[PDB]
Amino acid sequence: HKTFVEKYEKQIKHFGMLRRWDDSQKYLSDNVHLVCEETANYLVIWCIDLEVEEKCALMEQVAHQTIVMQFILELAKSLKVDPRACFRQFFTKIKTADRQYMEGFNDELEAFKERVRGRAKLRIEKAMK
DSSP states (O other): OHHHHHHHHHHHHHHHTOOSHHHHHHHHHHTGGGOSHHHHHHHHHHHHHHHHTTOHHHHHHHHHHHHHHHHHHHHHHHHTSOHHHHTHHHHHHHTOSSOHHHHHHHHHHHHHHHHHHHHHHHHHHSSOO
């Protein structure tokens, strides 16, 4: 919650703006404390913030990184290990010759962005009328 974000907000934003697998993996390896639900939670809100402000292109960029972190955290729950100890295997898995894991990632990413677009619209009905 609260002051993890006061502490690391600029680092979370930076991660949110990466894209290449090796760039993300290096950044996390260098900043392992960011591999946590607090980070994924912040990225979700930020996506909704960007979408509402019509920064749709940037929302799509941040959404990619949001799903990266969610996948990492899910993988960890899968193996019952700490996500800080196993996050590199997300990148290994995504790069596998059979593109099955990557396909599921892409599907979750597209679905996530649809949900973000819906959530954004709700914020302006929230007090549109």
